[PDB]
Paper text:
β-Propeller proteins are common natural disc-like pseudo-symmetric proteins that contain multiple repeats (‘blades’) each consisting of a 4-stranded anti-parallel β-sheet. In the larger propellers a so-called “Velcro closure” is found, in which the N- and C-terminal β-strands are part of the same β-sheet, keeping the propeller closed. This “Velcro” can occur in different positions; in the “Velcro 1-3” variant, the closing β-sheet consists of one N-terminal and three C-terminal strands, while for the “Velcro 3-1” variant, the opposite is true. Starting from a highly repetitive β-propeller sequence, we designed a consensus motif sequence that formed a perfectly symmetric 7-bladed β-propeller.
All the WRAP-T permutants expressed well and could be purified easily. Solving the crystal structures revealed that they possess an identical structure. Interestingly, the different position of the chain termini had an influence on the preferred crystallisation conditions and crystal packing. While for previously designed symmetric proteins, the proteins typically packed in distinct symmetric ways reflecting the inherent six-, eight- or nine-fold symmetry of the proteins, here no clear symmetric interactions could be observed within the lattice. This may be expected given the incompatibility of seven-fold internal symmetry with any space group. Despite the non-equivalent positions of each blade within the crystal structures, the proteins proved to be perfectly symmetric, with a TM-score above 0.97 calculated by CE-symm. Analysing the thermal and chemical stability of the WRAP-T permutants revealed that nvWRAP-T, lacking the velcro closure, is just as stable as the variant v13WRAP-T. While v31WRAP-T is considerably more resistant to GdnHCl induced denaturation compared to the other proteins, its increased thermal stability is not that significant. A striking difference however is the stability of the “non-Velcro” variant, the least stable for Pizza but as stable as the natural “Velcro” position in WRAP-T. This may be due to differences between the sequences, as the two different “non-Velcro” variants of Pizza have different stabilities as well.
Author numbering: 1 to 286
């Protein structure tokens, strides 16, 4: 990548890594660090990327106000138009049939893979910064600069507003068993919540804004990305397990391999880095 990497995701078998960048591309990489494809078509910075559960479809989010759907070989399949400002994040439903997009226009939109707008989730009072599907597919979680996470059903009905962060919420993730919700915030914390909206834990330790959060596939490990240039690994009890050091600028996103053994981090230093659960740096994708 020729500019900041803004997001990273692992394919379902973890053999392919997808990276989003301000250079307006998504790049696809093998686990061994070889560049496989560069997906070209967005007209401004790409802000996030997601793999479909089948590993065949890639979704990308962009400042050009669209989501694009791509196949694993780089073909553009759909352009999802409807947001009135920058799209900041994207997620697939667990059945791969629905795409959720987050936008500076203060909404989440829901789309089918044919590109039809299914629903607009309205309620946030400021930019929406990230979106996640519950692993049962029945709930949508959104993160916002209005300092909240909101939970929604597919009907667009607001279910819960999770309040407590003292600054913008930058990202959101469901645990693989759907029992826990993690949120990242400019207030330098990750907070863990249950589905009732109750705060379970506040993870403290990062020295600057937290930009993204992810669960291991067994839900036992939480990874957080920060402007303090680290990824931190945490257990469910909130204990800090590791600090992954090596990026030379802000870390913007993080993801786990499907066996939870490898962590991918995205950075403004224009790289993706791969790490072991032990905290050891493994590889750097440039």
């Amino acid at each position: 990548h020729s500019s900041s990497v803004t997001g990273v995701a692992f394919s379902p078998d973890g053999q392919t890594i997808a990276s989003a960048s301000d250079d307006k591309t998504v790049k696809l990489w093998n686990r061994n660090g070889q560049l496989l494809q560069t997906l070209t078509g967005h007209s401004s910075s790409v802000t996030g990327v997601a793999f479909s559960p089948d590993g065949q479809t890639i979704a990308s989010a962009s400042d050009d106000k669209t989501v694009k759907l791509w196949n694993r070989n780089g073909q553009l399949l759909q352009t999802l138009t409807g947001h009135s400002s920058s799209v900041t994040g994207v997620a697939f439903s667990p059945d791969g049939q629905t795409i959720a997009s987050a936008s500076d226009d203060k909404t989440v939109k829901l789309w089918n893979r044919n590109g039809q707008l299914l629903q607009t989730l309205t309620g946030h009072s400021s930019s929406v910064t990230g979106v996640a599907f519950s692993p049962d597919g029945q709930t949508i979680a959104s993160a916002s600069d209005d300092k909240t996470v909101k939970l929604w059903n597919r009907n667009g009905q607001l279910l819960q507003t999770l309040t407590g962060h003292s600054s913008s919420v930058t990202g959101v993730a469901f645990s693989p068993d759907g029992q826990t919700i993690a949120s990242a915030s400019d207030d330098k914390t990750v907070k863990l919540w249950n589905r009732n909206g109750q705060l379970l834990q506040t993870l403290t330790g990062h020295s600057s804004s937290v930009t993204g959060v992810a669960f291991s596939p067994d839900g036992q490990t939480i990874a957080s990305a920060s402007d303090d240039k680290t990824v931190k690994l945490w257990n469910r009890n909130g204990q800090l397990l590791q600090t992954l050091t090596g990026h030379s600028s802000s870390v913007t996103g993080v993801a786990f391999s499907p066996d939870g053994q490898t962590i991918a981090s995205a950075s403004d230093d224009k790289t993706v880095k791969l790490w072991n659960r032990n905290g050891q740096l493994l590889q750097t994708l440039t």
